[PDB]
Amino acid sequence: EFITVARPYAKAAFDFAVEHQSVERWQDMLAFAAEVTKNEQMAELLSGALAPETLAESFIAVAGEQLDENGQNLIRVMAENGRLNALPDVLEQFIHLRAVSEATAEVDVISAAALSEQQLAKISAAMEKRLSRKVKLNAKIDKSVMAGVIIRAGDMVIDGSVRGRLERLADVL
Amino acid sequence: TGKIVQVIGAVVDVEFPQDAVPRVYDALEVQNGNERLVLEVQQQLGGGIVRTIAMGSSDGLRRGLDVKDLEHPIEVPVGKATLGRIMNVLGEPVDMKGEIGEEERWAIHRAAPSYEELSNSQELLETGIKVIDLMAPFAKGGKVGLFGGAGVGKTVNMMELIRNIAIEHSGYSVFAGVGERTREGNDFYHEMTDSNVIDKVSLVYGQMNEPPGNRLRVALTGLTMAEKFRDEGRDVLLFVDNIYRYTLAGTEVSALLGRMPSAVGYQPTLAEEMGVLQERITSTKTGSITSVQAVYVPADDLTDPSPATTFAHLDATVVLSRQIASLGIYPAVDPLDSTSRQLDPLVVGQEHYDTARGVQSILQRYQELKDIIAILGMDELSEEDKLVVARARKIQRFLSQPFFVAEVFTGSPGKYVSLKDTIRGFKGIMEGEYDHLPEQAFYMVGSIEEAVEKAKKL
Amino acid sequence: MATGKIVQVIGAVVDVEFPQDAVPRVYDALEVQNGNERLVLEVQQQLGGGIVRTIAMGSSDGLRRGLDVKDLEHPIEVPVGKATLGRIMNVLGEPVDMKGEIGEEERWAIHRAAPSYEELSNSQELLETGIKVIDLMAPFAKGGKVGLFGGAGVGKTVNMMELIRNIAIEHSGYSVFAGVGERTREGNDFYHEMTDSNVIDKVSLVYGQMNEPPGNRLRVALTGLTMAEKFRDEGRDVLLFVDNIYRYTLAGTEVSALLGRMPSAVGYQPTLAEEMGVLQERITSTKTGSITSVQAVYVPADDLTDPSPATTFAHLDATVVLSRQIASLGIYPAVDPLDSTSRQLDPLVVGQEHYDTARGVQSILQRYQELKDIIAILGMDELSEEDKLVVARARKIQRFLSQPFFVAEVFTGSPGKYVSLKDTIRGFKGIMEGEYDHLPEQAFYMVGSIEEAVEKAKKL
Amino acid sequence: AQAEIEAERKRAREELRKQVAILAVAGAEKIIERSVDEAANSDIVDKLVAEL
Amino acid sequence: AQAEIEAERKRAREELRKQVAILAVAGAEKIIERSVDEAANSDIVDKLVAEL
Amino acid sequence: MQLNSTEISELIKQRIAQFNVVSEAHNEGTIVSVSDGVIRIHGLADAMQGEMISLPGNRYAIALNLERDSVGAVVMGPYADLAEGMKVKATGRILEVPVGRGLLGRVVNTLGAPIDGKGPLDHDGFSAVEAIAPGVIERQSVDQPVQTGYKAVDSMIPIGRGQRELIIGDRQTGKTALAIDAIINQRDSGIKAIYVAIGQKASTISNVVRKLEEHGALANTIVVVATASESAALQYLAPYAGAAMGEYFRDRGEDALIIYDDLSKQAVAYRQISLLLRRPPGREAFPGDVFYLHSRLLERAARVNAEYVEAFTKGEVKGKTGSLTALPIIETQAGDVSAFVPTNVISITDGQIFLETNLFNAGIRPAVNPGISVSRVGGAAQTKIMKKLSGGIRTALAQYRELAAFSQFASDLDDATRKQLDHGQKVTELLKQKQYAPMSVAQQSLVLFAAERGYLADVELSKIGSFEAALLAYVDRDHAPLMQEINQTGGYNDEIEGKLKGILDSFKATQSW
Amino acid sequence: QLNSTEISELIKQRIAQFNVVSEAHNEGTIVSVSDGVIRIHGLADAMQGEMISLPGNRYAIALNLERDSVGAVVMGPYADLAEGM
Numbered sequence A: 001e002f003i004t005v006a007r008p009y010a011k012a013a014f015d016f017a018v019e020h021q022s023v024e025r026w027q028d029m030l031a032f033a034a035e036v037t038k039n040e041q042m043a044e045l046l047s048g049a050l051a052p053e054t055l056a057e058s059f060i061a062v063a064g065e066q067l068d069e070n071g072q073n074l075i076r077v078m079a080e081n082g083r084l085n086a087l088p089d090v091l092e093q094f095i096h097l098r099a100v101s102e103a104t105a106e107v108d109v110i111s112a113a114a115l116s117e118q119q120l121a122k123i124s125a126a127m128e129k130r131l132s133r134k135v136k137l138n139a140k141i142d143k144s145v146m147a148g149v150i151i152r153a154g155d156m157v158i159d160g161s162v163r164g165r166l167e168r169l170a171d172v173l
Numbered sequence B: 001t002g003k004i005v006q007v008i009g010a011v012v013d014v015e016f017p018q019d020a021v022p023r024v025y026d027a028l029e030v031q032n033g034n035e036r037l038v039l040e041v042q043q044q045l046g047g048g049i050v051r052t053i054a055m056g057s058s059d060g061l062r063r064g065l066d067v068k069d070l071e072h073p074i075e076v077p078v079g080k081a082t083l084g085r086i087m088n089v090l091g092e093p094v095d096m097k098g099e100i101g102e103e104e105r106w107a108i109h110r111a112a113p114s115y116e117e118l119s120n121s122q123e124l125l126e127t128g129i130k131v132i133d134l135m136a137p138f139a140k141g142g143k144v145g146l147f148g149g150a151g152v153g154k155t156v157n158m159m160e161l162i163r164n165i166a167i168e169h170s171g172y173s174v175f176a177g178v179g180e181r182t183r184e185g186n187d188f189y190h191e192m193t194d195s196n197v198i199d200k201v202s203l204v205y206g207q208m209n210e211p212p213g214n215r216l217r218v219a220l221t222g223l224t225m226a227e228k229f230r231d232e233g234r235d236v237l238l239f240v241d242n243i244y245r246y247t248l249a250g251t252e253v254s255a256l257l258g259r260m261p262s263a264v265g266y267q268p269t270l271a272e273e274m275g276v277l278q279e280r281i282t283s284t285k286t287g288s289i290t291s292v293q294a295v296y297v298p299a300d301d302l303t304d305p306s307p308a309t310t311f312a313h314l315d316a317t318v319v320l321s322r323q324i325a326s327l328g329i330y331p332a333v334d335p336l337d338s339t340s341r342q343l344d345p346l347v348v349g350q351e352h353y354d355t356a357r358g359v360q361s362i363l364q365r366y367q368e369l370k371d372i373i374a375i376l377g378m379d380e381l382s383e384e385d386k387l388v389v390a391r392a393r394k395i396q397r398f399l400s401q402p403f404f405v406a407e408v409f410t411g412s413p414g415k416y417v418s419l420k421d422t423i424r425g426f427k428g429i430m431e432g433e434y435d436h437l438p439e440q441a442f443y444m445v446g447s448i449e450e451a452v453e454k455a456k457k458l
Numbered sequence C: 001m002a003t004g005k006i007v008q009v010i011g012a013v014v015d016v017e018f019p020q021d022a023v024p025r026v027y028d029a030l031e032v033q034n035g036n037e038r039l040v041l042e043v044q045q046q047l048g049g050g051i052v053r054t055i056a057m058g059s060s061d062g063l064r065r066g067l068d069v070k071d072l073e074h075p076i077e078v079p080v081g082k083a084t085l086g087r088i089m090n091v092l093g094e095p096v097d098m099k100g101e102i103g104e105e106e107r108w109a110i111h112r113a114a115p116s117y118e119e120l121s122n123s124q125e126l127l128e129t130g131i132k133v134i135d136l137m138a139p140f141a142k143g144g145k146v147g148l149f150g151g152a153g154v155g156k157t158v159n160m161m162e163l164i165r166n167i168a169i170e171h172s173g174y175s176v177f178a179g180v181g182e183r184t185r186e187g188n189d190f191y192h193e194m195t196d197s198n199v200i201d202k203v204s205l206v207y208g209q210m211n212e213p214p215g216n217r218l219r220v221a222l223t224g225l226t227m228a229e230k231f232r233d234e235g236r237d238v239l240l241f242v243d244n245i246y247r248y249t250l251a252g253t254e255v256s257a258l259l260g261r262m263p264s265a266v267g268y269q270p271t272l273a274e275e276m277g278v279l280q281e282r283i284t285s286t287k288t289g290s291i292t293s294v295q296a297v298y299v300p301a302d303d304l305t306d307p308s309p310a311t312t313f314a315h316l317d318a319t320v321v322l323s324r325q326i327a328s329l330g331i332y333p334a335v336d337p338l339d340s341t342s343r344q345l346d347p348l349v350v351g352q353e354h355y356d357t358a359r360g361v362q363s364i365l366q367r368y369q370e371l372k373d374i375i376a377i378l379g380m381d382e383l384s385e386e387d388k389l390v391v392a393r394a395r396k397i398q399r400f401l402s403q404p405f406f407v408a409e410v411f412t413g414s415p416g417k418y419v420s421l422k423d424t425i426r427g428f429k430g431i432m433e434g435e436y437d438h439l440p441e442q443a444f445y446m447v448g449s450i451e452e453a454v455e456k457a458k459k460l
Numbered sequence D, E: 001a002q003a004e005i006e007a008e009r010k011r012a013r014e015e016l017r018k019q020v021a022i023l024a025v026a027g028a029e030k031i032i033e034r035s036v037d038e039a040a041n042s043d044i045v046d047k048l049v050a051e052l
Numbered sequence F: 001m002q003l004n005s006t007e008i009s010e011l012i013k014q015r016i017a018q019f020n021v022v023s024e025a026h027n028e029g030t031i032v033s034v035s036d037g038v039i040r041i042h043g044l045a046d047a048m049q050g051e052m053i054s055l056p057g058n059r060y061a062i063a064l065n066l067e068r069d070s071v072g073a074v075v076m077g078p079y080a081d082l083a084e085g086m087k088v089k090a091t092g093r094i095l096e097v098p099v100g101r102g103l104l105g106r107v108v109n110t111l112g113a114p115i116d117g118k119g120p121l122d123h124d125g126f127s128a129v130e131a132i133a134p135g136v137i138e139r140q141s142v143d144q145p146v147q148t149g150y151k152a153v154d155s156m157i158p159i160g161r162g163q164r165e166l167i168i169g170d171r172q173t174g175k176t177a178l179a180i181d182a183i184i185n186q187r188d189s190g191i192k193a194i195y196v197a198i199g200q201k202a203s204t205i206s207n208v209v210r211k212l213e214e215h216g217a218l219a220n221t222i223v224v225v226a227t228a229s230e231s232a233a234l235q236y237l238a239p240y241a242g243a244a245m246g247e248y249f250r251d252r253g254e255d256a257l258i259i260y261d262d263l264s265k266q267a268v269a270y271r272q273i274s275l276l277l278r279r280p281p282g283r284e285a286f287p288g289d290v291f292y293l294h295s296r297l298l299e300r301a302a303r304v305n306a307e308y309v310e311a312f313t314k315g316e317v318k319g320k321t322g323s324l325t326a327l328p329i330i331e332t333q334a335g336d337v338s339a340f341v342p343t344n345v346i347s348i349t350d351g352q353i354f355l356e357t358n359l360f361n362a363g364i365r366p367a368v369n370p371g372i373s374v375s376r377v378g379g380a381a382q383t384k385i386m387k388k389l390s391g392g393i394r395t396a397l398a399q400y401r402e403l404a405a406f407s408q409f410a411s412d413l414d415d416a417t418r419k420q421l422d423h424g425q426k427v428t429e430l431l432k433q434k435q436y437a438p439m440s441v442a443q444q445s446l447v448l449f450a451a452e453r454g455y456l457a458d459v460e461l462s463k464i465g466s467f468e469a470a471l472l473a474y475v476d477r478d479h480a481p482l483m484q485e486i487n488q489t490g491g492y493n494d495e496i497e498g499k500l501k502g503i504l505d506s507f508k509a510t511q512s513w
Numbered sequence G: 001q002l003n004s005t006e007i008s009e010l011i012k013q014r015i016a017q018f019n020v021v022s023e024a025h026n027e028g029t030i031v032s033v034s035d036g037v038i039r040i041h042g043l044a045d046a047m048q049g050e051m052i053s054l055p056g057n058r059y060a061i062a063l064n065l066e067r068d069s070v071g072a073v074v075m076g077p078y079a080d081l082a083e084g085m
């Protein structure tokens, strides 16, 4: 998957967007450049052997919205190195860098029932203590959880489910 | 549900929805023109791609074909319904008879029996063949391997062992044709039908004709039938027509599966792939498998990885030499390289053990003299060294034997030799009881009585 | 402060990303906490932007992606001078003998350039070893380099122990012992041997140990050189012993594939000759001071073709080749006279008396090696009576080169012998002429002087 | 032959332990799910957010 | 010995049917972190007799 | 009896008493591919190298490549049930095995689960599978015997307590036979045994465990197994699992003997893992670190000084030196010692025993080649009686083989030569010995005294075998107090030489071969 | 899929002004240092076998002209050279 080759570009675009105070636009800009990449006929062209420049200028034409001389030049760089199919992974990494820089985390919370909201006030206040970041909740109701709740944040998990605790107990043959 | 996304030789990549990706070793199915093709799943790549081997010809496959996900491994008929019929790797009937009256089907991928289940046995099994049960005798429930190069006698020897063992034995038998000649499958089938012994034998054939994927899996189809008869509590004979072809079909696909080459270009998994097959061919406290395997030796190189790995798996090993076979001594067994776990004074007893070690000592000493003799000639030897040579040459000739299956070649009638006659015979030669007979007297005579009658007419 | 982060761990090789304006120099040391234990990394390569590829000076086990790395702006520096004497150190120059802190006044980087061409010296003063075959066939000089070549189990260690006993106790000066790739058992037995014989105060010991991660072995040899170079620059005359130079090269081979280099020859790194030359060219005697060194060289399967032993032959001055073909007969020291050689064996040093004696012995043994082929098939009766006499006197000289060592009594059970150079020459002349034509062959074997070979004949 | 049966003794005990445990937790899943309560569910959350 | 221990094996299975009922509630009471006088004991005894 | 099962149904309730409901926190990943026992995982930012990663079920993997953006790991078990998108949890744990005295007489796998079916283990806790060896200052010199019971090995190639001795040769030359006879002979020496089976077929293990059980030897032995069926990571890791069990005895002042069988196959399993992880191949397609694989394994076998034991035991055990002795086995393909794995292991060990096919076919069994075999500890490992006699044997016997070649067309043989060739044939005949028939010190010493004092010299060669059997029989009935003296002391003196002289003089007159 | 001199600050330079050909062909910067080889970004007018001058009055020979970089071999001690020189 493209993640490893997308990292160098994602940093440079975010760094540049910080200097020029344009991070929001750049996000909405990369969101278009990723989406044109997903179109079928455009995809065929990208898998083709068109020389970089001829590929780039035919891409840039479709990406009309792109800020000329900044967003459009970022395409020319990626076209020299044939990374254009990585654009969906150059985005999202840009969003990750942004969320780190804005000291903000999406955190997820999965339970047998819709949580009581008052509980979510406690959970968010706890997560803002566990991690020194503002925490957006987007919790879920799930049938698999017999009772209780899972808290998931980045790649750290705190299982509070009865499902997990039974299958944690069933372990001791 | 799936889509084909690459086709590289025998290997096909299929994409599935990420909620639905097939397990490893699942069977998939795809329509290829006017026939159905099965694919077996080997690896899960990322992103719902899955990499598979075609159980049939992959020519005419397009990209973008729709693939059906069967929820199970390759499963084959087992039990008495298979007896007397010829079946394919997929467990399909290949004789022109009707469908197989299966009651049960078993997945060809299985775990070996646990360490607690295994059983020991020391019951010596007799053979017709002077050199084999003298030099490398073997037990009921053990494994035998015939190692040799191209054209040395692996099949003819296995056909005598079938004739001798599998007709004085009373239980069922399984013969697995793995990457060998189709003519020899047809020749075998008939003489089984002409002898009316066919109804005790299940036959599975995956000959060289077939595409890689067939030659790879067909050995496991054969074991899975033999494991049903063993677990039923029977004593079973399993014959494998060439085990080397299983490893070679792994080599052919391994690069297309994206695995770095090892050693002499073999797959890196060679020892695990061989071991996971070999560990299933074991006798157990519930029931027994006696096994004979032919083992082709590429370029006669016994130090090649594929022979070298096979040697640790087996209880008796008989090694066939092109250098002997070009003398026309048959069976072309090398007694200085052939060996068995059963050549032990406790199981064989002392007379047999002493006779075998005497023969081994004289023939070794003859190898030590041959480099002197080649430059100097024999006249320079000592008068005891000349007696060692004069005996060793008689020993080499007396290891020769007429075979009932070989009558079509030599014309001469075959011989079955009791173990007692072999020990008595070789013990007499080494003691010098026969030092007055010519060498020609010993070549291709069944028993030592027959050497002295041949000597009267020279 | 801690400013790099780990970005890969594959085996012994660790990649660290620093900020693009503070990238570590090549061969800089770096520091990281591997749990409780502090770990050091040595920088091998700068690659990409800000990333550096490094070798761990210790186990990789328990490293994580993301750990903070501190940048020490110097290479690995080791204690040097008198404080080192009587101590055992690891590659990092840390005490491993439990005796406490080293108490140094100075520390030196292990990476440094060789002496310049103007600084070298040619003072080939002959040095006596007391070993018959070495002092005759391959005479040492003070300040030279000596290599003991051989495959496994041929006598490299006990020869080096005999040389350590004879010169290094007599030397009256400091010594360094580098246990590159040594067995931990034998490193212990040497430390007690030097302690019980009470010479340990003259010697400083650096040990690599085989067990240690690949990084330690690669650099322990440079640590040994750096202590010896400190004593040389003081102006002292020092002895340097190295327990196996081969294992320095073999440690390079392990990391070299992970450092992304494509391979060459029989799997060796491409840099093999550069790495060997950079080490060996520091071990030289300048106008200020002399280093005399004895190096053991492992020869894989006794194949002297192999690139690692074949390359080192050019850097030495005397080379002693120990052969399994001789060792199979049990006739230790197992030095092959037809392959061993020295720069000092010419009449302008040795004098004509010694030179004529060594050339004589070589010519007799060479001739006998041809005769030996005829005999094995045609038989000795088929020879000329001149060739039969040469075969006899050669087969005696072959045994007379044997000598029991009083570091080998545990193997032999017999008392070890020392010989002067003067007595050695007289003995070989005596076999080359008639004086001992009448003694058996077994009357020479593991004797000592010629003056006592007659006595074993009377006993035989 | 006697020591063999006292080895066999331990094999028979351990196999029965395995049986009863797995059928015990199989019962426990049915028993606990049918006995879920919203106050008890809230009390799970109220415990873990107190230590988190 | 095989005949003797198979007699003991069927006898032990009968007594442990009672003991495993106690197991299931003890697990449930720790897993719910609270003692529970659950009403639907029919579900316990149904599984208890059917699977053993 | 089985009502004890019913009583431990209360013990099942005691698990509930020990169990804890607390929520932990742990780091998480997803499996992104599965192939041939290797998995790639995305996530696990806090994974450490060599950590145990825990999978669905009770299955584990070892993290080996920590690349950027993915972890590569090997599955310790059957892999085929794993799938992409399975969640996976990183523990904090390194791999550990059960260890202790209770292990003796058990057959366990490389994870230490018993496979003999003799019920659960008894053990004294767990120890890490990977561990650093005792450093230079912590060792003591090897100077005690471990007896092989073979005339050839104990005379010529003595093994001391804490040595590493390579057994090397081609297939079917007696490599395993020598090593399990070395186990069998420890039945009463006080040395504990470990047999590690890497990559063997399970019925071969079942047969060797049977022979250990026909003799008294199984009660003193741990058997660690990774069969040819098991994954390439169960093997590879087995030798380390065996060493961790041997170290428990080593660090409490006890002696252990560990036989790693087919260390070569450990290398083949490690090559499989390395190529499937796409690490660059080196010579002969093995990875370059394959020397570090074996050298760190074999440098664990060591004798430690008493101070190290006291520190480890915290003063419970004082004044006792512990030792672990390793006997690795290597298979050569055609006597070719130049292969990469043989050259590495020959470099590491304290000696080797070469077994070879030409001697074995000639009937010289055990087929020990005196010339290329050597012990680097030598006489310091022997008892004084064996030390005194055997030093003469091995180098004399090597030169006999040189002399016999040079002789082969010489018709006149000088009396020194005639005597040497005669003596050498009679010693070559004397060192042959039957399998499973180990000889005590006093028996070996007496038979060597017969050779080195020339009592054999007149005896006709085929009778030399019967001479030895009759001499051992005679001395056991008539002179057993001396056999006890020699076996207990190992001593040698003028009265010992006199009493042995008297016994040989008396036997050779009075008895018949 | 793998990186070929795709490094963050070089990428950022191009985004600001893609036409960096406006800077002189005569000069460049070191971007890697290993084993006596350096890789140089720039030197658009380098030629096969040309001498490149390094700090400390040192030289390297230009031996690979690649599409993005020059590979050059240092004619002296190299271990103090650093990226961004």
Ligand SMILES: Nc1ncnc2c1ncn2[C@@H]1O[C@H](COP(=O)(O)OP(=O)(O)OP(=O)(O)O)[C@@H](O)[C@H]1O
Residues within 6 Å of the ligand: B148, B149, B150, B151, B152, B153, B154, B155, B156, B157, B296, B330, B331, B403, B406, B409, B410
């Ligand atoms: N016992 C025998 N008597 C006479 N001829 C024999 C004997 N064994 C082998 N041969 C000769 O060798 C030929 C080949 O033998 P066989 O077919 O068994 O070889 P193989 O080892 O199976 O070779 P391949 O590897 O090609 O299958 C036979 O056709 C026959 O000509």
Ligand SMILES: Nc1ncnc2c1ncn2[C@@H]1O[C@H](COP(=O)(O)OP(=O)(O)OP(=O)(O)O)[C@@H](O)[C@H]1O
Residues within 6 Å of the ligand: B312, B340, B341, B343, B344, F170, F171, F172, F173, F174, F175, F176, F177, F178, F331, F365, F366, F433, F434, F435
């Ligand atoms: N001292 C001995 N005397 C007689 N026979 C022996 C002796 N030692 C071993 N053998 C026999 O040699 C054969 C092979 O021995 P063993 O199995 O130990 O060899 P190996 O080298 O381990 O074989 P493999 O390479 O298959 O492991 C067996 O039949 C055994 O009985």
Ligand SMILES: Nc1ncnc2c1ncn2[C@@H]1O[C@H](COP(=O)(O)OP(=O)(O)O)[C@@H](O)[C@H]1O
Residues within 6 Å of the ligand: C151, C152, C153, C154, C155, C156, C157, C158, C159, C332, C333, C405, C408, C411, C412, F374, F375, F376, F377, F378
């Ligand atoms: N000079 C010698 N005298 C007696 N035995 C020796 C001699 N040299 C070597 N040996 C024998 O060879 C063995 C190995 O030699 P050693 O030097 O210890 O190994 P290496 O040569 O590999 O360092 C010694 O233990 C001893 O058995």
Ligand SMILES: [Mg+2]
Residues within 6 Å of the ligand: B154, B155
């Ligand atoms: Mg055939």
Ligand SMILES: [Mg+2]
Residues within 6 Å of the ligand: C152, C153, C156, C157
């Ligand atoms: Mg050595």
Ligand SMILES: [Mg+2]
Residues within 6 Å of the ligand: F175, F176, F177
């Ligand atoms: Mg074996």
